[PDB]
Amino acid sequence: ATKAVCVLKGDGPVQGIINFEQKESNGPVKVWGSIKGLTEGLHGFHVHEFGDNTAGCTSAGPHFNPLSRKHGGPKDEERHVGDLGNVTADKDAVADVSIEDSVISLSGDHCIIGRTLVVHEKADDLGKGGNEESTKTGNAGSRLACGVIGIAQ
Amino acid sequence: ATKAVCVLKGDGPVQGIINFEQKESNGPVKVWGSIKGLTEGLHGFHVHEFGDNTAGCTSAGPHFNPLSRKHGGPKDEERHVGDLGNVTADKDAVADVSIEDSVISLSGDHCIIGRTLVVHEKADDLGKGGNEESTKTGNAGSRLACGVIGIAQ
Ligand SMILES: *[Se]c1ccccc1C(=O)NCc1ccc(OC)nc1
Ligand SMILES: *[Se]c1ccccc1C(=O)NCc1ccc(OC)nc1
Numbered sequence: 001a002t003k004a005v006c007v008l009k010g011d012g013p014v015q016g017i018i019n020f021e022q023k024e025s026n027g028p029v030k031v032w033g034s035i036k037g038l039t040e041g042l043h044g045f046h047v048h049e050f051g052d053n054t055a056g057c058t059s060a061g062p063h064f065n066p067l068s069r070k071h072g073g074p075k076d077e078e079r080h081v082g083d084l085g086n087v088t089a090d091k092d093a094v095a096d097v098s099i100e101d102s103v104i105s106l107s108g109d110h111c112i113i114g115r116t117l118v119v120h121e122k123a124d125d126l127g128k129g130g131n132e133e134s135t136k137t138g139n140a141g142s143r144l145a146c147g148v149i150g151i152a153q
Numbered sequence: 154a155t156k157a158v159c160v161l162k163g164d165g166p167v168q169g170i171i172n173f174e175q176k177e178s179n180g181p182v183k184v185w186g187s188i189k190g191l192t193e194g195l196h197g198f199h200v201h202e203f204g205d206n207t208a209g210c211t212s213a214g215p216h217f218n219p220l221s222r223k224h225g226g227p228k229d230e231e232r233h234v235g236d237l238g239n240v241t242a243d244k245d246a247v248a249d250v251s252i253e254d255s256v257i258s259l260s261g262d263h264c265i266i267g268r269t270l271v272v273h274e275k276a277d278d279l280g281k282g283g284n285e286e287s288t289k290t291g292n293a294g295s296r297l298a299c300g301v302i303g304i305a306q
């Protein structure tokens with residue numbers, strides 16, 4: 001089993017810790033942890049192409065998209081590898097994260113280690129928004145917090 | 154060519170940006186950038202095993218040592234893969250970093266992507282010190298700043 005971890009930090013109140021575990025090289029990745037400081041509602045949750053935080057979360061570039069697909073939701077065939085959908089925050093400003101994903105990996109060409117995890121301002125419309133940006137970013141807006149995905153013990 | 158980047162931050166004023174570039178997968182890695190807020194003199198400069206910053210730089214674990222060797226300097230055959238020696242700060246509290254290393258890589262099994270770069274409190278004695286810890290840590294002391302090494306554009 002392979003493990004990875006991401007510490008989410010930004011310029012505002014949003015802070016979190018996200019764990020990744022993959023039991024088998026061909027297998028689903030469990031994604032879990034907690035994000036605090038979020039406004040109530042949905043927040044886009046994506047792996048971005050670059051593990052570059054030189055100038056903050058903007059440096060991470062677009063969604064991680066090694067297969068040159070359109071943006072979608074995690075349950076869609078047409079999605080970026082980095083498309084993990086939304087995390088949901090309650091009035092307590094906390095999102096409990098508990099995801100299992102079959103497209104990301106911690107090995108091979110879909111590997112997300114060394115890329116950036118980002119939590120966004122607004123809801124990801126999962127490419128169902130009906131405008132051009134829906135097919136690229138899901139209209140999830142600005143980047144509240146991010147971190148480079150690292151190898152864990 | 155493969156590129157990687159690391160943003161160094163910690164609990165004090167030490168902050169830096171380190172760039173990595175490798176022209177060919179089997180080839181030397183150029184390491185360059187700047188670290189500010191350092192005390193004048195040598196500071197141990199290492200890649201640590203885990204890209205885990207959960208509880209700060211301590212979470213990164215020991216020096217990256219895939220070959221189970223003793224600690225050394227970058228010019229030594231007997232070294233950890235993560236042993237990049239020292240960066241030197243002047244009275245201006247800045248270290249100009251300019252390293253070429255043949256043992257680290259950004260491709261293949263000695264890859265440092267997803268691991269943590271750490272700048273240390275004290276000088277690394279490059280395993281030439283008068284004690285047991287010299288062969289493990291180089292006596293470079295506590296971790297001033299660190300970051301996860303990410304994939305760059
Ligand atoms: Se998966 C990946 C992405 C980018 C760079 C390097 C890797 C990688 O697989 N190699 C290092 C690695 C990853 C995970 C573990 O688990 C213990 N060991 C090494
Ligand atoms: Se760095 C490493 C170690 C073991 C397996 C695979 C890798 C790897 O480098 N893959 C991810 C990667 C890194 C850099 C770039 O640059 C475009 N693309 C993919």
Ligand SMILES: [Zn+2]
Pocket residue numbers: 046063070071072079080082083136137138
């Ligand atoms: Zn996407």
Ligand SMILES: [Zn+2]
Pocket residue numbers: 199216223224225232233235236289290291
């Ligand atoms: Zn060492």
